[PDB]
C-alpha cells in the first residue's frame, strides 16, 4: 500500500495522493481525496488553496521557441486548504495520523460530463507536445485566487481519467447491400460479418465476406480497411479520419457466380509512426503507448460537444471489371478489458 508524494522546490509545501488514474463508470468515478502538508510558520500570512483543471493544450512546457499554449480550459475548480473551512476518507484519516497536525485534507468529485485523456501523434515538421487534453492539479498559497504565484509557494501534478470494457455483449456485426446495372434486373449482392462487436488491443479481427454476382460484370479485385475517426468540438464541429490498417485481396467473382471467404487483420502501431494526426490514449509525460481506445458515451444525450472523441469502423470494397466498384462498412468498439 504505497502512496505518492510531490513537493515544492522549497520543500516546505508537499502533497500526498494514493492514485493517478480514475475509472469512469458512466454513472460515477472515484473521488479526488488528497492531503496537503505545510507548517504555516513559513508562509505566516497568506491563504492556502488547491485547484482542479482540465485543459486543452499544445506545445511542450520546456522552453520552446515558437508560438504555443492555446490554453482553452474545459472545466476548473478551487478549494481552500487553509484556513480550515464531505468528511475525510479512510486513507485520508490514516494519512493524517501518519503525517501530523500540519497536514490537511481536501476533496473533489469529478462531474460525469467530460472527456478522457488523449493525444495525437506529431508530424516530423511539428515540434514539442502535439495538441491534447489533460487533467491537472495545482496547489499554492496567496492572498487571493487572483494574486500571482511563486515557485516556492506552489506544486503541480498530473492525473488521468480512463474507461474499460463493459460487461454486457451486443448483437452480431454484419452488413449487406445489392448493386445492379441498368441493362436488366441482373444484380450484385455484397455481404460481410465479424467475430464480435468488441475486441482488445492487439487482437486479430476476422472478416467473413460473401458476394452474389448475378450481374453483367466480373468482380476483379477485393480490398478491406479499418479506419480511425476523430471528432473535435472545441468551438466548431469538425472531423478527422485515417486508415489505420488495410489489406488488398486478389479474389474474383464472375457474373452468374457466387463467392465467400474469410480474411484476418491486425491493427498495430509500429508501422505508422509517421502518420501525423494519429490518435493515442494519453501518456503521463512522454511515454510510448497503444492506439487510442474507442471512448464510450453515456446513455443520455447530454451536450456531447466537449474536447475530443473517437471511434472506428471497417470498410469493405468490391472492385469490378468494366466499372462499378462498390463498398460497405460497419462500426465496432476497441478497449482494454477491466483490470483485476
Amino acid at each position, epitope marked *: 500500500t*504505497r502512496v505518492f508524494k510531490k513537493s515544492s522546490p522549497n520543500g516546505k509545501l508537499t502533497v500526498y495522493l494514493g492514485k493517478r488514474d480514475f475509472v469512469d463508470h458512466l454513472d460515477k468515478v472515484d473521488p479526488v481525496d488528497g492531503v496537503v502538508l505545510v507548517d504555516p510558520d513559513y508562509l505566516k500570512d497568506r491563504k492556502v488553496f488547491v485547484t482542479l483543471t482540465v485543459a486543452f493544450r499544445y506545445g511542450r512546457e520546456d522552453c520552446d521557441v515558437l508560438g504555443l499554449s492555446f490554453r482553452k480550459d474545459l472545466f476548473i475548480a478551487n478549494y481552500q486548504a487553509f484556513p480550515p473551512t464531505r468528511p475525510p476518507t479512510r486513507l485520508q484519516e490514516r494519512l493524517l495520523r501518519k503525517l501530523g497536525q500540519h497536514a490537511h485534507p481536501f476533496f473533489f468529485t469529478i462531474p460525469q460530463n467530460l472527456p478522457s485523456s488523449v493525444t495525437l501523434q506529431p508530424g516530423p515538421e511539428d515540434t514539442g507536445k502535439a495538441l491534447g487534453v489533460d487533467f491537472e492539479i495545482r496547489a499554492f498559497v496567496a492572498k487571493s485566487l487572483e494574486e500571482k504565484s511563486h515557485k516556492r509557494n506552489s506544486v503541480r501534478l498530473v492525473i488521468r481519467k480512463v474507461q474499460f470494457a463493459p460487461e454486457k455483449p451486443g448483437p452480431q456485426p454484419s452488413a449487406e447491400t445489392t448493386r445492379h446495372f441498368l441493362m436488366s434486373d441482373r444484380s450484385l449482392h455484397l455481404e460481410a460479418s465479424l467475430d464480435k462487436e468488441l475486441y*482488445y*488491443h*492487439g*487482437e*486479430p479481427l476476422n472478416v467473413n465476406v460473401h458476394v452474389t454476382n448475378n450481374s453483367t460484370k466480373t468482380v476483379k479485385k477485393i480490398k478491406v480497411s479499418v479506419r480511425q475517426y476523430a471528432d473535435i468540438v472545441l468551438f466548431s464541429t469538425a472531423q478527422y479520419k485515417v486508415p489505420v490498417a488495410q489489406v488488398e485481396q486478389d479474389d474474383q467473382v464472375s457474373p452468374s457466380s457466387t463467392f465467400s471467404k474469410v480474411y484476418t487483420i*491486425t491493427p*498495430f*502501431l*509500429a508501422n505508422n509512426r509517421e502518420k501525423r494526426g494519429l490518435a493515442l490514449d494519453g501518456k503521463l509525460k512522454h511515454e*510510448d503507448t*497503444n492506439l487510442a481506445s474507442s471512448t464510450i458515451v453515456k446513455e443520455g444525450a447530454n451536450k456531447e460537444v466537449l474536447g475530443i472523441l473517437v471511434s472506428y469502423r471497417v470498410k469493405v470494397k468490391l472492385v469490378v471489371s468494366r466499372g462499378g466498384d462498390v463498398s460497405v462498412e460497419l462500426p465496432f468498439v476497441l478497449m*482494454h478489458p477491466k483490470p483485476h
Partner: antibody, heavy 118, light 107 residues
Framework: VQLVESGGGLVQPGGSLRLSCAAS????????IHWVRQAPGKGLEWVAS????????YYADSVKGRFTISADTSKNTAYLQMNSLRAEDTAVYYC?????????????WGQGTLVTVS | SDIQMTQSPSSLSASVGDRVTITCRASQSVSSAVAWYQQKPGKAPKLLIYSASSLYSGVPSRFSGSRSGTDFTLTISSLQPEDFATYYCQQYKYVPVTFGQGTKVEI
C-alpha cells in the same frame, strides 16, 4: 497452449546455429517473446527479446552484434541466429512469453534445448 | 546500470512442517517490479508471486511475500514434501533484468 524448439547440438565453434520456437494458444501481435539461458550450477539469464507490437529489440551486452532475433506473424513463430559460436555460450536456452499489456512475468515456458560447443 | 541482486539464505533443513523466509536485496529501490519462481532441477521455471504480493493462480496459500524499500521478502508458512525445491527471484524495473542463485533442500 504449447511452446517447442529445435535447431542443434554439439558443434565446432566459429559457426552459427539457427534456432526456433513456435507458439499456439495466443497470437503474437498481443505478446512478446524472450529467450533465457542457464548453465551447469547456474541459474537463468536473459539474452534477448522481441516486441511485435512496437517492434523494439534489446540485447545483453555480451551478445550485441553477435546475436540476431526475429519472428514472423504468419507463423506465430520466433527465431534467433547467433554467429561465430564459442564454448562460453554453451547453455540450455528457453523460449518464453509475456503479456504486452502489461509485463507480469514469464507465464508459460518452452521445453528448452542444450547447445554446446568446444 | 546492472541492478545488483543478492538472495539469502542458502540452505536449511525442512522436514515436513516449518515456517521460513527467503529474501532478495537490491542496489536501488524499485516500487514493486519483482516476482518469484520455483523449479525442480532440469525442468521449466514456474512463477509463484509477482508485484511482490500478487499470488499466481492455483498456488497453494502457503506462499506469500511483501516489500520494504530495497528489501523483498517471501514467506513459506508450511514446508511440505511436494514443495521440497529450490527457488529464485527476479527484478525488472529496468532492462536488463536481474535475479539470484538458488536454494537447497537437505533434510
Amino acid at each position: 497452449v504449447q511452446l517447442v524448439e529445435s535447431g542443434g547440438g554439439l558443434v565446432q565453434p566459429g559457426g552459427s546455429l539457427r534456432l526456433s520456437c513456435a507458439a499456439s494458444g495466443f497470437n503474437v501481435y498481443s505478446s512478446s517473446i524472450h529467450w533465457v539461458r542457464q548453465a551447469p550450477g547456474k541459474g537463468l539469464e536473459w539474452v534477448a527479446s522481441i516486441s511485435s507490437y512496437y517492434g523494439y529489440t534489446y540485447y545483453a551486452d555480451s551478445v550485441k552484434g553477435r546475436f540476431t532475433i526475429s519472428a514472423d506473424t504468419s507463423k506465430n513463430t520466433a527465431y534467433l541466429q547467433m554467429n561465430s559460436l564459442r564454448a562460453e555460450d554453451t547453455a540450455v536456452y528457453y523460449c518464453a512469453r509475456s503479456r504486452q499489456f502489461w509485463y507480469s512475468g514469464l507465464d508459460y515456458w518452452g521445453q528448452g534445448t542444450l547447445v554446446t560447443v568446444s | 546500470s546492472d541492478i545488483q541482486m543478492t538472495q539469502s539464505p542458502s540452505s536449511l533443513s525442512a522436514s515436513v512442517g516449518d515456517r521460513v523466509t527467503i529474501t532478495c536485496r537490491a542496489s536501488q529501490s524499485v516500487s514493486s517490479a519483482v516476482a518469484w519462481y520455483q523449479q525442480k532441477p532440469g525442468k521449466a521455471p514456474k512463477l509463484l508471486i509477482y508485484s511482490a504480493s500478487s499470488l499466481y493462480s492455483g498456488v497453494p496459500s502457503r506462499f506469500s511475500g511483501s516489500r520494504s524499500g530495497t528489501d523483498f521478502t517471501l514467506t513459506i508458512s508450511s514446508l511440505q514434501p511436494e514443495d521440497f525445491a529450490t527457488y529464485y527471484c527476479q527484478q525488472y524495473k529496468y532492462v536488463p533484468v536481474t535475479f539470484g542463485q538458488g536454494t537447497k533442500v537437505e533434510i
